Ligand binder design. Sequence first.
Ligand SMILES: *[C@@H]1O[C@H](CO)[C@@H](O)[C@H](O)[C@H]1NC(C)=O
Ligand SMILES: *[C@@H]1O[C@H](CO)[C@@H](O)[C@H](O)[C@H]1NC(C)=O
Lengths: 48, 48
Amino acid sequence: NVSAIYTYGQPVPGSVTIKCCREASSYYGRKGNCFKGNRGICTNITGE
Amino acid sequence: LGPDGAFYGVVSLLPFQMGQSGFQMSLGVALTVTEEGTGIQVTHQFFI
Ligand SMILES: *[C@@H]1O[C@H](CO)[C@@H](O)[C@H](O)[C@H]1NC(C)=O
Ligand SMILES: *[C@@H]1O[C@H](CO)[C@@H](O)[C@H](O)[C@H]1NC(C)=O
C-alpha cells in the first residue's frame, strides 16, 4: 500500500515499479553442495 | 516405431527439480507400448 508526496503535500504522478525476490538456500557449493536452488525466482510489477 | 522395432527416448531433466530438496532419490518411469490395430498394450514400470 504505497503512497508518495512532495515536500509541501502534493501528489506525484509517475510510474511506481516494485520488484521482490530472494535466494533459495545457498548451501555453499563445490566440496559442499555444488548446484543448489536457482538464482531465485524474481517477479516484477509496475503501476501508475 | 516400425522399421525394425526401436525407440530412442531422450528425456530432458530440466523441468525436473534436479539440484533442490524436492528429491526422493527415485525417478519412477513407466513405458507402455501399443499397436495400431489391436488396442492391447504392454506396460513396464521401474525406478531409476
Ligand atoms: C522486471 O524487471 C526485470 C529486470 O531484469 C525485467 O526483465 C522484467 O521484464 C520486468 N518485469 C516485467 C513484467 O516486464
Ligand atoms: C541404443 O543403443 C545405444 C545405447 O543407448 C545408443 O547409442 C543408440 O543410439 C540406441 N539406438 C536406438 C535405435 O535408440
